C-alpha cells in the first residue's frame, strides 16, 4: 500500500479504486456536496 510499501502481489488487477468506487456508488448522493 502507500502507508505500507508492502503491497499485495499483483501483475494486472485493480484493488484500491475498486472499493473506492463501491463506497462511492453506495453514497447515492447524486448531489453529493464534496470536493
Amino acid at each position: 500500500h502507500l502507508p505500507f510499501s508492502k503491497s499485495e502481489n499483483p501483475v494486472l488487477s485493480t484493488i484500491a479504486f475498486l472499493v473506492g468506487l463501491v463506497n462511492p456508488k453506495t453514497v447515492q448522493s447524486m448531489t453529493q456536496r464534496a470536493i
Binding site: 485493480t14 484493488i15 484500491a16 475498486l18 472499493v19 468506487l21 463501491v22
Partner: peptide, 29 residues
C-alpha cells in the same frame, strides 16, 4: 432477453438480519 449474465436491482428491501453475500461489489484488496 438475456445475455448469459445476471444483474442486481435497486428497489428491494432488507430483513436487516441477512446472511448472504455476492462478489458483485469488488472489495478486492
Amino acid at each position: 432477453s438475456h445475455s448469459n449474465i445476471d444483474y442486481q436491482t435497486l428497489l428491494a428491501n432488507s430483513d436487516h438480519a441477512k446472511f448472504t453475500i455476492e462478489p458483485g461489489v469488488l472489495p478486492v484488496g
